[PDB]
């Protein structure tokens with residue numbers, strides 16, 4: 001299929017692109033490189049075994065989007081582009097609403113103009129808000145995210161749903177990601193945060209690689225087995241694969257298809273650390289810190305739906321998530337070159 | 339004060355402008371005339387007793403907005419501009435989200451750029467969603483609007499609140515309107531809907547003026563005293579005055595000031611019809627029709643807060659609302675000239 005991958009040079013996007021190319025699709029990547037580098041492109045081609053077209057641009061530029069869609073005879077769009085640093089979002093709400101809400105709106109409007117009606121959205125478990133019922137199931141009503149980031153993802157879900165209602169031929173997937181971690185098995189691609197990583201895994205990796213002293217564990221007093229926060233960590237490759245399938249299976253299937261994408265199991269902070277210590281063959285240094293504002297104590301996905309309906313499920317383990325990250329981290333300590 | 343009035347040529351905006359000019363403020367109107375006509379401008383000047391500056395433009399044009407704000411040394415902004423036909427919103431969600439959500443975002447961003455931090459937003463009772471507790475009080479948590487229109491107003495409230503948090507010097511008023519009706523006492527200004535009016539009053543007026551046959555009463559089986567829908571009708575002049583006060587009193591008072599703007603009392607469909615029959619000296623023809631999708635049975639505002647805090651309250655009656663509308667309707671059957 002002909003697929004436009006916004007944010008295709010980013011973490012999850014890059015990996016998805018490799019997988020798409022492996023399944024022989026024609027990929028066109030659209031990224032503004034605000035959080036990624038051109039240096040990944042070659043890697044994606046190599047690992048993908050096929051050349052993906054790259055366009056440097058902004059999802060907010062509706063005329064460009066339209067031209068692209070047209071020019072490339074796109075069939076389906078996978079939208080990963082956006083801002084995602086939760087903390088920052090709180091400090092800088094406007095940027096989030098613009099990039100995420102306005103960003104998506106401009107894109108789907110361009111789609112409409114170009115007669116493109118197959119869409120995949122990168123959503124997040126945050127939309128469930130403070131749900132005491134765990135694991136989280138898709139049929140649960142949404143809640144209220146506590147950051148401009150979370151709110152922006154929920155808003156986009158809402159707009160997309162409304163769009164589909166008004167334009168019923170549209171096929172729209174709302175993929176609610178859980179906690180993506182891991183890296184390509186090759187260790188030649190992976191997450192490349194700039195500055196202080198906000199997520200647990202990369203932070204651990206940075207401690208491990210010797211860049212940072214100790215991992216701060218945000219809270220040791222939660223109502224969990226070990227008192228640390230619990231989440232559903234999913235391997236970026238499994239995520240990648242799920243997008244490929246979603247894309248292939250849902251194209252031209254009218255509706256709003258909502259699926260949780262996770263392992264369907266919870267792992268605590270220590271579990272992850274332990275997993276990483278094991279992978280890197282040394283104890284990861286850590287310490288206990290106060291709870292982090294806005295963090296829930298524990299949650300994980302109920303991923304039955306994607307299984308049943310898309311025959312999709314995670315195949316990588318936590319170990320692999322840790323190992324693959326360590327490999328990348330260790331093979332490319334400076335990330336992607338400038 | 340120097341005040342930018344978006345959507346200043348529209349129904350509520352026009353009346354507010356007259357009042358502002360009467361209190362000696364410098365008014366600059368920004369409207370794209372998608373739902374209003376230049377023909378009102380002269381009327382606003384006349385009735386206002388002072389000349390307001392008019393700029394034809396779009397709130398979505400952030401560079402223009404910034405220039406204006408700068409050029410005119412604006413102190414405060416009153417934002418009435420937007421799309422508001424509920425029904426249409428359902429059919430055309432994108433236009434609503436763009437004009438209302440993106441429209442407001444572009445404006446407040448321009449504000450930020452121009453160092454303008456006093457803002458007044460036209461919100462709506464719809465944000466309360468399906469609240470069984472009536473009347474509605476500001477401290478009630480918001481609900482889920484059932485149209486793209488309602489949703490767009492709630493979203494903007496949310497973004498504005500987040501903005502204020504991040505930019506705490508901002509003074510932001512969320513004025514939740516109830517059911518605005520009425521017209522300038524002069525009968526030379528009023529609501530000028532194009533096509534079929536969606537609101538009760540104008541529709542009644544059109545039946546009365548002989549343009550339409552009968553008023554369709556949407557539902558006669560509600561759990562109300564007379565079985566018809568109940569709402570809080572407020573006179574456009576009272577609304578106008580409330581904006582003037584809000585503006586004068588809240589400027590430079592940091593925070594998110596939320597106020598319901600209504601009469602604080604409920605009136606049924608028949609009550610309104612009866613009021614109008616009386617005003618026009620003839621029976622208004624009507625008939626019972628099925629419930630209208632999305633309509634709640636009854637609600638009205640709890641307007642104590644604006645009273646207490648702004649010393650503001652409605653002074654016009656339902657009779658006057660009806661009379662003033664009839665006068666305008668009857669003196670200007672073709673509305674504002676082309």
Ligand SMILES: NC(=O)c1ccc[n+]([C@@H]2O[C@H](COP(=O)([O-])OP(=O)(O)OC[C@H]3O[C@@H](n4cnc5c(N)ncnc54)[C@H](O)[C@@H]3O)[C@@H](O)[C@H]2O)c1
Pocket residue numbers: 006007008009010011012013030031032033034035036057058059060079080081082083084099103122123124125177178179180199
């Ligand atoms: N990584 C996670 O933990 C997490 C969990 C759930 C949801 N998501 C969502 O998945 C998507 C991808 O996540 P990621 O980890 O790969 O992030 P990433 O930062 O590595 O990828 C985002 C990419 O989008 C690009 N981009 C940003 N704004 C853009 C704009 N306006 N126009 C064009 N390009 C733009 C960035 O340059 C980057 O290449 C995002 O929408 C993110 O919100 C991620």
Ligand SMILES: NC(=O)c1ccc[n+]([C@@H]2O[C@H](COP(=O)([O-])OP(=O)(O)OC[C@H]3O[C@@H](n4cnc5c(N)ncnc54)[C@H](O)[C@@H]3O)[C@@H](O)[C@H]2O)c1
Pocket residue numbers: 344345346347348349350351368369370371372373374395396397398417418419420421422437441460461462463515516517518537
């Ligand atoms: N009238 C009501 O019953 C109702 C109740 C509550 C809330 N509101 C809100 O109050 C505000 C004013 O209501 P109204 O009855 O005066 O409506 P109106 O249509 O008469 O006024 C809206 C004005 O905004 C202008 N406009 C629309 N989109 C614009 C854009 N993108 N840029 C520039 N100008 C634009 C229109 O040309 C018009 O002059 C609206 O935001 C409406 O949602 C109204």
Ligand SMILES: O=c1ccn([C@@H]2O[C@H](COP(=O)(O)OP(=O)(O)O[C@H]3O[C@H](CO)[C@@H](O)[C@H](O)[C@H]3O)[C@@H](O)[C@H]2O)c(=O)[nH]1
Pocket residue numbers: 084124125126177178179180198199200201203215216217218219228229230231269292295
């Ligand atoms: O240095 C760190 C980083 C994280 N944690 C803990 O590790 C867990 C996971 O935290 P993190 O990697 O930051 O994940 P999340 O806060 O769960 O958020 C991610 O996953 C969500 C979906 O579940 C998405 O909404 C977000 O975009 C994404 O960043 C939590 O219990 C954190 O408290 C620490 O203790 N120390």
Ligand SMILES: O=c1ccn([C@@H]2O[C@H](COP(=O)(O)OP(=O)(O)O[C@H]3O[C@H](CO)[C@@H](O)[C@H](O)[C@H]3O)[C@@H](O)[C@H]2O)c(=O)[nH]1
Pocket residue numbers: 422462463464515516517518536537538539541553554555556557566567568569607630633
């Ligand atoms: O031809 C008509 C029009 C209306 N009604 C009834 O009259 C009442 C008021 O209806 P309408 O004038 O359309 O008002 P609302 O539906 O209450 O909505 C208005 O007031 C809301 C705030 O309370 C705002 O959210 C909206 O922007 C605004 O249009 C309702 O019970 C309607 O069912 C009829 O029976 N027939």
Ligand code: NA
Pocket residue numbers: 090091503504
């Ligand atoms: Na801040």
Ligand code: NA
Pocket residue numbers: 334335336
């Ligand atoms: Na680097």
Ligand code: NA
Pocket residue numbers: 165166428429
């Ligand atoms: Na429709």
Ligand code: NA
Pocket residue numbers: 672673674
């Ligand atoms: Na006319």
